[PDB]
């Protein structure tokens, strides 16, 4: 039974389900799961879990995530992008340097709201302002962080660029927002997850298309994700009560990696095997001074282990 992250690409089209259901059916194992959904229309990385890999999607949902998106000035649909009905069509008439500036002004963080914008009385927009201003109960508005956006290109009426996220953030609201800066709205018409953390779209792989052997024999072993965090490996003679319950203590460490307090770090063994996941319960500089002292309290806190 093989236990990690499997790096999928969703082809346009299908839904994420529609991918966990495909890996589900030929890999015949006893769980799948997936972290951080992409709309049918677009297409890009996808996180798979597999087995207890599932166990550790909650770290990969908190990456970053870079996308490449493309966006129609002065078209307005309900949904936000072409796959959206057509609600509204205005007209646009700016300047490469207005656009521009509008898009870069989004850079940092600014509380948006789902895609709405009806063809209705009280509903078009009015409603997207207010609910924008936080003014709506059922439409309260998340704060996000846009890191970055770059590879800006401008071609007619069709823009494109390259945007570095904070999770929860939608594209196609982020498009509505610069539309609406320029007067004129906007709507996604194309829209790729180059990337999710360190996974690379280059680097997923199309489970449809790709034969049992190839997606099992393509899953990341739990030994090899979670890639940054810090890791701690203990005496292998202490692998068996760790597996059980059993907390970490000084003594019981042979070799740091660093870490500060509430920090989460990865337990291995001598022979390589990852046996679980826990918090430090002191820094690590102050390790030292824990020895010196024939003090041997707990050093890292159990937060899962990997009894696979
Ligand atoms: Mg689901």
């Known amino acids: 039974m093989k236990h990690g992250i499997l790096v ?3 082809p346009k089209g299908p839904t994420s389900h529609d991918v966990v259901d495909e890996v589900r059916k030929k890999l015949k194992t006893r769980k799948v799961g997936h972290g ?3 709309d049918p229309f677009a297409c890009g990385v996808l996180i798979i879990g597999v087995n207890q890999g599932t166990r550790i999607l909650e770290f990969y949902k908190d990456l970053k995530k870079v996308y490449w ?5 002065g078209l307005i649909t309900e949904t936000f992008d072409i796959t959206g009905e057509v609600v509204e069509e205005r007209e646009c008439n700016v300047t490469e340097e207005e656009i521009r500036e509008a898009i870069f002004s989004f850079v940092g963080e600014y509380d948006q709201v789902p895609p709405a914008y009806s063809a209705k009385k009280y509903k078009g927009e009015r409603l997207y302002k207010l609910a924008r201003e936080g003014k709506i109960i059922n439409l309260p508005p998340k704060r996000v962080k846009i890191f970055k956006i770059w590879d800006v290109n401008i071609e007619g009426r069709d823009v494109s660029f390259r945007v570095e996220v904070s999770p929860g953030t939608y594209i196609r609201s982020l498009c509505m927002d610069i539309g609406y800066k320029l007067g004129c709205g906007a709507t996604a018409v194309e829209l790729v997850r180059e990337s999710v953390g360190p996974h690379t779209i280059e680097e997923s792989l199309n489970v449809f298309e790709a034969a049992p052997e190839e997606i099992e024999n393509r899953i990341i072993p739990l030994e090899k994700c979670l ?3 810090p890791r701690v490996v203990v005496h292998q003679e202490s692998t068996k009560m760790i597996l059980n319950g059993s907390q970490i ?6 070799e740091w990696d660093g870490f500060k307090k509430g920090e989460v770090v990865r337990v291995f063994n001598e022979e390589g095997r990852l046996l679980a996941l ?8 102050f390790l030292e001074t824990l020895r010196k002292h024939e003090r041997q309290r707990r050093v890292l806190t159990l937060r899962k282990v990997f009894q696979t």
């Open 278 to 285: 826990a918090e430090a319960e002191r820094n690590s500089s």
């Open 69 to 73: 998106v493309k966006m129609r000035l």
């Open 8 to 10: 999928a690409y969703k």
């Open 249 to 254: 203590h000084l003594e019981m460490l042979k």
């Open 36 to 38: 951080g959904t992409l």
């Open 227 to 229: 890639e940054w965090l």
